[PDB]
Amino acid sequence: SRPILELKEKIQPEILELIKQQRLNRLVEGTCFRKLNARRRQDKFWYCRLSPNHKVLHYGDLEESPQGEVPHDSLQDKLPVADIKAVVTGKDCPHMKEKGALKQNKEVLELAFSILYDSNCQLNFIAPDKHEYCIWTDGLNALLGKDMMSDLTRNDLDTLLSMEIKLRLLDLENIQIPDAPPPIPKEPSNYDFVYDCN
């Protein structure tokens, strides 16, 4: 499958952009995200909806809505997508290093993500589980315009690339691809097509 593998991974980007566009859709539909230490009458659930334009984020201390995202003007309808330095994931979150009242336990080490903005403000949030944590980081990095960080993302890449290529080898069925490509027959220099064009 050496010619097959070359031809397969060589036409990569379409699945990549499809994955990322889906991630953007997932961010837009969003969910009621999770806050820090929302124990005493603090709304742990709260939606963070990406703009359909994907430039602003509708988020804030929204209520405990089990249905999820509600379309309206959230507590803060802006997150500046043009200046976010990064998102800190895991131990890099300072709130994980908190040793006082906001001690995020070791059971949320993989659920910690904070948006870097204003160079002094952070958005220390929690994910309900790993897969959506990685999904949100994926969507953010897509806004950041870089690679993805979900195991499920690699899963999707491999499975769908295999599906597409497996569909393509139907014309060459019972035929083989010489890993050394066939030599190009020489083209006569004249372009005087005796029969008409088109």
Binding site: N53, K55, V56, D77, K78
Partner: protein
């Protein structure tokens, strides 16, 4: 810009924002309305390059709702409520003051250079309307001399004091903190003494060399502060009516400085009271 729609490119509109739109909140809302959300910084003048360039450029700022003309209301001692309604509604004129430095930037003083290039805006229709916004119809600039600015500042201060005095004179269960607010701020121009600032700016004979024929305005300043002092008197008496023990040192300071300024204007400024 040019990417704006046909009726939007190189256009200017006036928006009837919400009751408490801080400027940048409304700016954020407008950016939500648009891609290419970049904000210009030469707020007053347009950009000729951008009068044709793509990449839609915008700019937003609050403007002053110029008072309407309540008909058959010009002199009758009508209560405020109808006027406060007329402050914002049924309006078509809108102005915006333009700070400008004109003259020497001497350190202790700025009122030697202030020249306001106010910008009056007239739109075809009258807020409120079918649309929460409207395109400006005619644009007009203005020019204001430091004498003039001193004037307008002075009266608008006077009417503000009158307004607070009357609004508290009709309702008794009313906070006295605004009275402290004003009475303090006027009594001690602590950060910079506005009165002496007028004196150096215009009352000095130097200005009467820059403005010999234009001394018919410094006398207007004199008459306007002259009408100010009795308003300060009603302010002092109103405070005394609403005075408390914490305000007692405050009130005595106000009263002492008030009669000080009284004698000063009568003789030191030489202005004749009524």
């Amino acid at each position: 810009g040019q990417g704006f729609p046909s009726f939007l490119r190189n256009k200017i509109f006036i928006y009837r924002g919400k009751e408490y739109e801080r400027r940048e909140d409304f700016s954020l809302r407008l950016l939500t309305q648009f891609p290419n959300a970049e904000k210009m910084t030469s707020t007053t003048p347009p950009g000729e390059d951008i009068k044709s360039s793509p990449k839609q450029y915008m700019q937003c700022f609050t403007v002053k709702p110029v008072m309407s003309l309540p008909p058959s209301y010009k002199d009758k001692p009508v209560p405020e409520q109808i006027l406060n309604y007329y402050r914002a509604n049924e309006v078509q004129q809108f102005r915006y003051s333009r700070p400008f430095r004109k003259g020497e930037k001497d350190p202790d003083n700025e009122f030697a250079t202030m020249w306001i290039e106010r910008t009056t805006y007239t739109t075809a229709y009258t807020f409120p309307g079918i649309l929460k916004w409207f395109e400006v119809k005619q644009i007009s600039t203005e020019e204001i001399s430091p004498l003039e600015n001193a004037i307008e500042t002075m009266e608008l201060t006077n009417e503000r004091i009158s307004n607070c005095v009357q609004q508290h004179a009709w309702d008794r269960s009313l906070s006295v903190h605004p009275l402290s607010m004003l009475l303090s701020g006027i009594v001690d121009p602590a950060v910079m003494g506005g009165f002496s600032n007028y004196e150096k700016a215009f009352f000095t004979e130097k200005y009467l060399q820059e403005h010999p024929e234009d001394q018919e305005k410094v006398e207007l300043l004199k008459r306007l502060i002259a009408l100010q002092m009795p308003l300060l008197t009603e302010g002092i008496r109103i405070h005394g009516e609403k005075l408390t023990e914490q305000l007692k040192p405050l009130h005595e300071r106000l009263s002492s400085c008030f009669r000080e300024l009284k004698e000063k204007v009568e003789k030191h400024y030489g202005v004749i009271t009524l």
